[PDB]
Symmetry: C2
Subunit: 270 residues, 2 copies
Amino acid sequence: ASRGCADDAGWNDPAMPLKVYGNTWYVGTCGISALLVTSDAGHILVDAATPQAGPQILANIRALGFRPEDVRAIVFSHEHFDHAGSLAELQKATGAPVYARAPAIDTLKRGLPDRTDPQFEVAEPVAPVANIVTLADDGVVSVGPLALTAVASPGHTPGGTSWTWRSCEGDDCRQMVYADSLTAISDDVFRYSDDAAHPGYLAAFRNTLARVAALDCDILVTPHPSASGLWNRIGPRAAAPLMDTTACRRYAQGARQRLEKRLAEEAATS
Amino acid sequence: ASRGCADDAGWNDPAMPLKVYGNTWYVGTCGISALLVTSDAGHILVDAATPQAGPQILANIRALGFRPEDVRAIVFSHEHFDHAGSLAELQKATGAPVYARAPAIDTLKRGLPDRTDPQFEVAEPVAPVANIVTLADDGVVSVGPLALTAVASPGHTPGGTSWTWRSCEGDDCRQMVYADSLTAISDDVFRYSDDAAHPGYLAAFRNTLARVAALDCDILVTPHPSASGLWNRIGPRAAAPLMDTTACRRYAQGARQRLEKRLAEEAATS
Ligand SMILES: [Ca+2]
Ligand SMILES: [Ca+2]
Ligand SMILES: [Mg+2]
Ligand SMILES: [Mg+2]
Ligand SMILES: [Mg+2]
Ligand SMILES: [Mg+2]
Ligand SMILES: [Mg+2]
Ligand SMILES: [Mg+2]
Ligand SMILES: [Mg+2]
Ligand SMILES: [Mg+2]
Ligand SMILES: [Zn+2]
Ligand SMILES: [Zn+2]
Ligand SMILES: [Zn+2]
Ligand SMILES: [Zn+2]
Ligand SMILES: [Zn+2]
């Protein structure tokens, strides 16, 4: 019997790919999520993990019997190296456009962020993405019968996006939410409380928390699987239900608590 | 043990009131539905059954421990005597406004329909309703934390409306649908196929069927409880699940089949 993934798994530690629900499949690593949403008309790939993960994701797609060339759209959570790292690699393999909200586009073209990213100084360099389609903040990415809805989720980054869609097993259909990271973490310089340095940025983060908390949410998945206890819900160590309609509310509420702790930490330092 | 209601129950045969789900309660008769949606800020009454049913509905509200004076809005399915019959009676008892779409208002003010009703010649006279609030075709009726969304459902009548809302038992929340009648029945004169006599009417009926079929639908209830097999899902004779996410689709599909049978019948007669 396979032993499954640890919550503190390395970002590049391999995971055997497995169904999440219906036509949503997990193709990421033990430490970093990537999802494949499939149809007979082609697929949507969600996230790219770390600049090193291209090959594992591609191997995992094929392990499930899907062809990377049948992926017709790529979307992602946010423009940090640990989720956008293999986008260019995956675009070449699939031929698919990458969809990005406006505040992520320059980062994807450079392969590095700018000072608008809270984690600017700790960024690792990425391959640029060549074919980017600008995604409206409430846009829908459609491939055949598939439709993934964007929920703009700035805060952890300027360009972050949560994604939502329906997956079915026969007539039993579930609202899937791939909620973006909501951690208020930074490099050693950035201060969430310095509004003059980034006007409206923290307010937008608070608004993201409220929007995520309010989503219709049957099955939650997060870019770091442990942030939603994914390995306690699927795979060999699963001991809790996959479906929990309170999950997005609890996720956002915890994130709000942690955001306010970060603000307290900033108040305590000059 | 109580024996429960028959599917061919008389419209005025009494039913003991019982929870449907959460804060949605059944307060109608064995043959004709009425629902009460409750909150600590007041309630919404859905439908009025037959001109004779005022007292049973009011008794049933009180049997559950709710006060008619705490009802703050009344809505209804459609403007036939067997669903709108006791509206004026219930308005007096509750003091609540009745919400109606534009094509039902004159019928509610007269207490009889006009020739726009397929069943005009078989109408029974109703008490007029004095305080009517005009409801937009996609309007929301709000009372405290309650919010009922209108889905205009012309076809069986010009003014018919389906209603949808969420009811919860703790954290387990359900999308309730009180779908209007979809039966293509008439008096001896009306022809659904005579578009010149009522331009666009049948197209609107077909559009209603499509809209109802597409609703998010956890628990379906219908003005005639048997039309959705309600007594096979709640009460003493229940043998099938209350929740069925296919119910609105199946309801509308059956109705489409019956509508097309009606068109065949009309083609066969001059
Ligand atoms: Ca995360
Ligand atoms: Ca009915
Ligand atoms: Mg692998
Ligand atoms: Mg790579
Ligand atoms: Mg930038
Ligand atoms: Mg959580
Ligand atoms: Mg009774
Ligand atoms: Mg009466
Ligand atoms: Mg009229
Ligand atoms: Mg049915
Ligand atoms: Zn990040
Ligand atoms: Zn990350
Ligand atoms: Zn649902
Ligand atoms: Zn009727
Ligand atoms: Zn009726």
